[PDB]
Amino acid sequence: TVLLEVPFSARGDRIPDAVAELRTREPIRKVRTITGAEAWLVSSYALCTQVLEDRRFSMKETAAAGAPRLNALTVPPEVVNNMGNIADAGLRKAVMKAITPKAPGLEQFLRDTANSLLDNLITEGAPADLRNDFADPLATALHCKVLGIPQEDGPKLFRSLSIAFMSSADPIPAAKINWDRDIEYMAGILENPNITTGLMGELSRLRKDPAYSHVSDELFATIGVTFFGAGVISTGSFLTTALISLIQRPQLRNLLHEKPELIPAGVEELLRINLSFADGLPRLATADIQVGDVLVRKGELVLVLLEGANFDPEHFPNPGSIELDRPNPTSHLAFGRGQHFCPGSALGRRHAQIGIEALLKKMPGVDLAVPIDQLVWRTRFQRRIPERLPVLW
Ligand code: HEM
Ligand SMILES: Nc1cccc(-c2cccc(-c3cn[nH]c3N)c2)c1
Ligand SMILES: Nc1cccc(-c2cccc(-c3cn[nH]c3N)c2)c1
């Protein structure tokens, strides 16, 4: 037989029985990635947290020439370290402020947008596609608003993303075409005097502030492209697969409809059980480091399997069960942990809470319109998502 291959399954509606057997028997194990490289797959909560909290397991070094790769880069190497470059440029606080859901009018914009999407679907009549015609448009709208760019520009930026977030053994020609086009767009946004709000409005002013005169124009455009893309794919994909989890649980659907104040606790459990990340998070060892029974050598690739941690019964008892009263509810790794913890975590939570709240109010009888096994799971992609999510109500 051959070395165990990753990823195990592109299905995002159920975790393979194999994850638990692996966590029990070999919570750090050698695997082969789609490039042919070997890697260490880490699947216990204890060992996942160890790796993510040890900066000697480096994110930015995964982009080094000649390194073992999970998949091919779809961006310039520089972009892997985007957050680090943001911090170095003195821009961290400004970016963080721009992407909080606490911005005035933001939460109202999201409710209005979700309700308008849902009303259109209702007028159209069942079946409706909750990914393409609800979750992703809601994510796209949200990020145009957060960035301060026109809503009409959202769809064009969105269309890059089915290629941008591919998980490919080889470089993708279309990825560079789309990247360069999107950078040109964001550079234009920075020169556009009408753009005065949101992240791009603030970046446009900092660009002309003397305290930032030696920060490159390319970094400013890059922040816009990177935050739009990673945000839209992460929120759209999470909400989509969370809606599947909810639809599959009519009693939970009914409980949250009846007591919407439990929706935050519900979204937090839906984050914990979410299978939207298709691959472990990659890190490259910059030293020889003991992880469980394995001495990981300098230059080796480590993959942090988020559902490994998040379904670990030693940390989350009855891990497949959605429990709204856990003692450790936010201690999951859905947003990562440590140096690279997600800066959009609050925005992601609110996108999902508001989307779910609006759906349950508009479509209290929502159900799948096809048998679950008929969902088509996107392959060789950095997220697990159904190509369409047909529902009736
Ligand atoms: C439900 C929504 C989201 C989920 C599940 C999610 C998940 C994650 C995870 C797991 C990481 C850690 C990656 C690693 O350590 O290798 C991360 C980092 C990051 N996220 Fe998110 N994310 C979400 C929303 C967002 C949003 C809305 C934005 C921006 C608008 C965003 C921007 C980023 C960035 C820039 C990083 C890299 C941070 C760094 O390198 O220090 N994410 N996210
Ligand atoms: N929301 C999210 C989740 C996981 C990773 C990122 C993120 C943010 C910035 C850059 C990169 C990136 C681009 N190429 N390779 C990597 N790791 C990835 C964002
Ligand atoms: N080629 C392309 C075009 C537009 C956006 C992006 C993009 C933007 C942000 C993150 C990533 C990415 C690629 N691999 N992993 C991550 N997070 C990719 C790439």
mmCIF file of N, CA and C in Angstrom, residues 74-76 78-79 157 159-160 164 172-188 218 221-222 225:
data_model
loop_
_atom_site.group_PDB
_atom_site.id
_atom_site.type_symbol
_atom_site.label_atom_id
_atom_site.label_comp_id
_atom_site.label_asym_id
_atom_site.label_seq_id
_atom_site.Cartn_x
_atom_site.Cartn_y
_atom_site.Cartn_z
ATOM 1 N N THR A 74 -1.264 30.494 -5.016
ATOM 2 C CA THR A 74 -2.109 31.213 -5.965
ATOM 3 C C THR A 74 -1.963 32.718 -5.818
ATOM 4 N N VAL A 75 -1.011 33.133 -4.984
ATOM 5 C CA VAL A 75 -0.664 34.535 -4.785
ATOM 6 C C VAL A 75 0.847 34.697 -4.827
ATOM 7 N N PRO A 76 1.329 35.942 -4.936
ATOM 8 C CA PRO A 76 2.750 36.203 -4.678
ATOM 9 C C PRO A 76 3.184 35.767 -3.263
ATOM 10 N N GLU A 78 4.897 36.984 -1.001
ATOM 11 C CA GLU A 78 4.773 38.104 -0.066
ATOM 12 C C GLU A 78 3.422 38.100 0.684
ATOM 13 N N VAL A 79 2.360 37.713 -0.021
ATOM 14 C CA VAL A 79 0.987 37.755 0.495
ATOM 15 C C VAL A 79 0.741 36.742 1.618
ATOM 16 N N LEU A 157 -15.283 40.917 -8.373
ATOM 17 C CA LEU A 157 -14.211 40.450 -7.482
ATOM 18 C C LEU A 157 -14.475 39.012 -7.039
ATOM 19 N N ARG A 159 -15.907 36.585 -8.599
ATOM 20 C CA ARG A 159 -15.718 35.580 -9.645
ATOM 21 C C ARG A 159 -14.269 35.054 -9.687
ATOM 22 N N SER A 160 -13.318 35.824 -9.180
ATOM 23 C CA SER A 160 -11.939 35.325 -9.043
ATOM 24 C C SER A 160 -11.806 34.140 -8.085
ATOM 25 N N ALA A 164 -8.967 31.333 -7.083
ATOM 26 C CA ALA A 164 -8.045 31.842 -6.085
ATOM 27 C C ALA A 164 -7.827 30.878 -4.928
ATOM 28 N N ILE A 172 -1.476 27.831 -11.153
ATOM 29 C CA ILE A 172 -2.700 27.981 -11.925
ATOM 30 C C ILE A 172 -2.613 29.240 -12.786
ATOM 31 N N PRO A 173 -2.575 29.100 -14.123
ATOM 32 C CA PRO A 173 -2.423 30.327 -14.932
ATOM 33 C C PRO A 173 -3.485 31.404 -14.669
ATOM 34 N N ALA A 174 -4.734 30.979 -14.525
ATOM 35 C CA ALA A 174 -5.833 31.922 -14.302
ATOM 36 C C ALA A 174 -5.626 32.709 -13.009
ATOM 37 N N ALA A 175 -4.930 32.132 -12.027
ATOM 38 C CA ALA A 175 -4.788 32.792 -10.725
ATOM 39 C C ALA A 175 -3.996 34.080 -10.837
ATOM 40 N N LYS A 176 -2.917 34.067 -11.619
ATOM 41 C CA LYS A 176 -2.134 35.257 -11.826
ATOM 42 C C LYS A 176 -2.904 36.304 -12.627
ATOM 43 N N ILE A 177 -3.658 35.879 -13.639
ATOM 44 C CA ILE A 177 -4.469 36.810 -14.421
ATOM 45 C C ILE A 177 -5.438 37.565 -13.492
ATOM 46 N N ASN A 178 -6.162 36.806 -12.674
ATOM 47 C CA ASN A 178 -7.160 37.384 -11.764
ATOM 48 C C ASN A 178 -6.509 38.245 -10.682
ATOM 49 N N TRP A 179 -5.366 37.798 -10.151
ATOM 50 C CA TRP A 179 -4.668 38.548 -9.106
ATOM 51 C C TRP A 179 -4.248 39.920 -9.623
ATOM 52 N N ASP A 180 -3.645 39.943 -10.812
ATOM 53 C CA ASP A 180 -3.122 41.191 -11.349
ATOM 54 C C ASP A 180 -4.279 42.153 -11.634
ATOM 55 N N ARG A 181 -5.386 41.623 -12.146
ATOM 56 C CA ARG A 181 -6.577 42.425 -12.454
ATOM 57 C C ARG A 181 -7.176 43.019 -11.193
ATOM 58 N N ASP A 182 -7.262 42.200 -10.150
ATOM 59 C CA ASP A 182 -7.849 42.633 -8.888
ATOM 60 C C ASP A 182 -6.956 43.672 -8.186
ATOM 61 N N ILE A 183 -5.638 43.493 -8.247
ATOM 62 C CA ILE A 183 -4.704 44.510 -7.739
ATOM 63 C C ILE A 183 -4.885 45.840 -8.481
ATOM 64 N N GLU A 184 -5.060 45.780 -9.794
ATOM 65 C CA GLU A 184 -5.214 47.011 -10.584
ATOM 66 C C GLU A 184 -6.484 47.731 -10.159
ATOM 67 N N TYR A 185 -7.531 46.948 -9.920
ATOM 68 C CA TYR A 185 -8.794 47.489 -9.418
ATOM 69 C C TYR A 185 -8.599 48.183 -8.079
ATOM 70 N N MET A 186 -7.914 47.532 -7.143
ATOM 71 C CA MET A 186 -7.763 48.106 -5.808
ATOM 72 C C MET A 186 -6.840 49.328 -5.815
ATOM 73 N N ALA A 187 -5.860 49.335 -6.708
ATOM 74 C CA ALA A 187 -5.004 50.514 -6.873
ATOM 75 C C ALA A 187 -5.835 51.706 -7.354
ATOM 76 N N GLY A 188 -6.757 51.450 -8.272
ATOM 77 C CA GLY A 188 -7.683 52.476 -8.727
ATOM 78 C C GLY A 188 -8.589 52.995 -7.630
ATOM 79 N N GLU A 218 1.913 48.998 -3.286
ATOM 80 C CA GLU A 218 1.525 47.630 -3.561
ATOM 81 C C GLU A 218 0.967 47.015 -2.277
ATOM 82 N N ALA A 221 -2.840 48.098 -1.887
ATOM 83 C CA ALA A 221 -3.722 47.372 -2.802
ATOM 84 C C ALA A 221 -3.851 45.923 -2.360
ATOM 85 N N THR A 222 -2.735 45.353 -1.918
ATOM 86 C CA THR A 222 -2.715 43.947 -1.525
ATOM 87 C C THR A 222 -3.600 43.666 -0.319
ATOM 88 N N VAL A 225 -7.244 43.380 -1.635
ATOM 89 C CA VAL A 225 -7.539 42.148 -2.378
ATOM 90 C C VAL A 225 -7.591 40.972 -1.420
#
